Amino acid sequence: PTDIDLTDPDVYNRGVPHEQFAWLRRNEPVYWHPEEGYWAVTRHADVVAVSRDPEIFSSQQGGTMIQDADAAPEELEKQRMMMLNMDPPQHTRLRKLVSKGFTPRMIAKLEDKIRERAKQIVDEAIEKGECDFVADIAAELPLQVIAELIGVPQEDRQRLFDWSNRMIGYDDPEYHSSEADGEQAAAEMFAYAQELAAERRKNPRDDIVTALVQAEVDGQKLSDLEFNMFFLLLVVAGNETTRNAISHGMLALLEHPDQWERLRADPSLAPTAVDEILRWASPVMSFRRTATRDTELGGQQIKAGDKVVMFYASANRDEEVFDDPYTFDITRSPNPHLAFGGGGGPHYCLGANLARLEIRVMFEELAERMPDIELTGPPERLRSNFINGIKHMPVRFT
């Protein structure tokens, strides 16, 4: 087709450009886009290869955002204490410090409380009748859960939601008002997080803030900025990913009504349904790396300093991996999708167990309760070159 600029948010205004991805996978799977420029990596195996080699494909050298913020090097330095933008050994140490609360056994203990919240959220949405599926359901469950898990009082959860909207929504006019919105949001959140850390140091609780201030690995503890940036990461990741998998998942189930019928008849399909909802929605569309040295990928020569972009949404339609990839099949198995990153990468989603649980519980509850969910208008996409997000989705229940 054309040589679309896949770092341009407007390219995604009418949905994920899956035909361009499909053409690239078949014809130019490792493709240099000129513009200085970037390599588009669109095949499943190549995204896996890039992800599992941080020595060659660095997250630190040029950060992980896909658009050229090169001549503003102050924004790279403002984000370099983000765990996402660290290479080993720095990243290894930080990941060990923060990982304890997200092991499967730690996440498994949350299922009953998550289920209680999802049941109440769905109940209140059903009584409301007409509502926004995002604000009242898809956003509300992960927001309540992430507040309770972190240790933020439920009364303050709306501040968490507004902050993270301002931090990721820098390309959407509704979510942000000026170029310093996210920086100011970060300053406010850092002040809030430090208050919480101070309280839990004096008086520990069973929450993630207490786990973080108490954590100690190899004689190391979290510094103030390390704590602040992980607190931020948890809040934003918790509020800007799961809700989009839920929104796009509900949309796909309504757009493929036979699949929704079968989930409501057999709720034991929910685990595989979650993975197909993640493959389908690919809420995190892409992440960037930078080649630390000359190297070859898919028979293509990548130089030191070259920007390399992994497109997870393209990999999640790779015909070599998924049979009939444009079919939404909630029983698809196996389903080695890359929605959480390439398998084998050191940055593979720390919250993957929590995300799956939240999505599974929510759609179970939406299924067990069997209201007739129906769209009353077109969903409004988030303007972004990074998130595949739904801002609003008006629906009617029963």
Ligand X SMILES: CC[C@H](CC[C@@H](C)[C@H]1CC[C@H]2[C@@H]3CC=C4C[C@@H](O)CC[C@]4(C)[C@H]3CC[C@]12C)C(C)C
Query: Considering only residues 35-64, where is the footprint of ligand HEM by CB under 6 A?
Result: 51
Q: Which residue is nearest to ligand HEM (CB)?
A: 351
Applying CB under 6 A, among 164, 242, 247, 259 the residue interacting with ligand HEM is 242
Spatial CB neighbours of 77, under 8 Å, sequence gap ≥ 6: none
Q: Which does 234 bind (CB under 5 to 8 A by kind): ligand X, ligand HEM, none?
A: ligand HEM
Q: Which does 183 bind (CB under 5 to 8 A by kind): ligand X, ligand HEM, none?
A: ligand X
> Which two structure tokens, joined as six digits, stand for 344?
């084998």
Q: Residue 397 CB, nearest distance to ligand HEM (Å)?
A: 24
Q: Which is nearer to ligand HEM, 163 or 287 (CB)?
A: 287
Q: Which is nearer to ligand X, 85 or 295 (CB)?
A: 85
Q: Which residue has the tokens 């896996």?
A: 48
What string of H, E and C letters represents the secondary structure of the chain? Answer: CCCCCCCCHHHHCCCCCHHHHHHHHHHCCEEEECCCCEEEECCHHHHHHHHCCCCCEECCCCCCCCCCCCCCHHHHHHCCCCHHHCCCCHHHHHHHHHCHHHCHHHHHCCHHHHHHHHHHHHHHHHHHCEEEHHHHHHCHHHHHHHHHHHCCCHHHHHHHHHHHHHHHCCCCCCCCCCCCHHHHHHHHHHHHHHHHHHHHHHCCCCCHHHHHHHCCECCECCCHHHHHHHHHHHHHHHHCCHHHHHHHHHHHHHHCHHHHHHHHHCHHHHHHHHHHHHHHHCCECEEEEEECCCEEECCEEECCCCEEEEEHHHHCCCCCCCCCCCCCCCCCCCCCCCCCCCCCCCCCCCCHHHHHHHHHHHHHHHHHCCCCCEECCCCEECCCCCECCEEECEEECC
Which residue, among 280, 250, 276, 279, has the nearest Cα to 332 in the 3D structure?
276
Is 238 near ligand HEM (CB under 6 A)? yes
Is 234 near ligand HEM (CB under 6 A)? yes
Is 241 near ligand HEM (CB under 6 A)? yes
Cα–Cα–Cα angle for 271, 277, 280, rounded to 5 degrees: 145
Q: Which stretch binds ligand HEM (CB under 6 A): 123-131, 195-203, 233-241, 385-393?
A: 233-241
Is 95 near ligand HEM (CB under 6 A)? yes
Q: Which residue is nearest to ligand X (CB)?
A: 183
Q: Which is nearer to ligand X, 118 or 167 (CB)?
A: 167
Is 138 near ligand HEM (CB under 6 A)? no
Q: Residue 364 CB, nearest distance to ligand HEM (Å)?
A: 16
Q: Residue 274 CB, nearest distance to ligand X (Å)?
A: 18
Is 84 near ligand HEM (CB under 6 A)? yes
Q: Residue 352 CB, nearest distance to ligand HEM (Å)?
A: 7
Is 245 near ligand HEM (CB under 6 A)? yes
Q: In the complex, which residues of this chain contact ligand X (CB under 6 A)? A: 78-79, 82, 84, 167-168, 182-183, 186, 232-233, 236-237, 240-241, 284, 387
Query: Considering only residues 308-367, where is the footprint of ligand HEM by CB under 6 A?
Result: 339-342, 345, 347-351, 354-355
Is 302 near ligand HEM (CB under 6 A)? no
Is 233 near ligand HEM (CB under 6 A)? yes
Q: Which stretch binds ligand HEM (CB under 6 A): 21-29, 197-205, 241-249, 373-381?
A: 241-249
Is 284 near ligand HEM (CB under 6 A)? yes
Q: Residue 185 CB, nearest distance to ligand X (Å)?
A: 7
Which residue, among 41, 38, 18, 19, has the nearest Cα to 29 in the 3D structure?
41
Q: Are 359 and 253 in contact (CB under 8 A)?
A: no
Q: Which is nearer to ligand HEM, 382 or 397 (CB)?
A: 382
Q: Which does 78 bind (CB under 5 to 8 A by kind): ligand X, ligand HEM, none?
A: ligand X
Q: Are 39 and 302 in contact (CB under 8 A)?
A: yes
Residues that bind ligand HEM (CB under 6 A): 51, 83-84, 95, 146, 233-234, 237-238, 241-242, 245, 283-284, 287, 339-342, 345, 347-351, 354-355
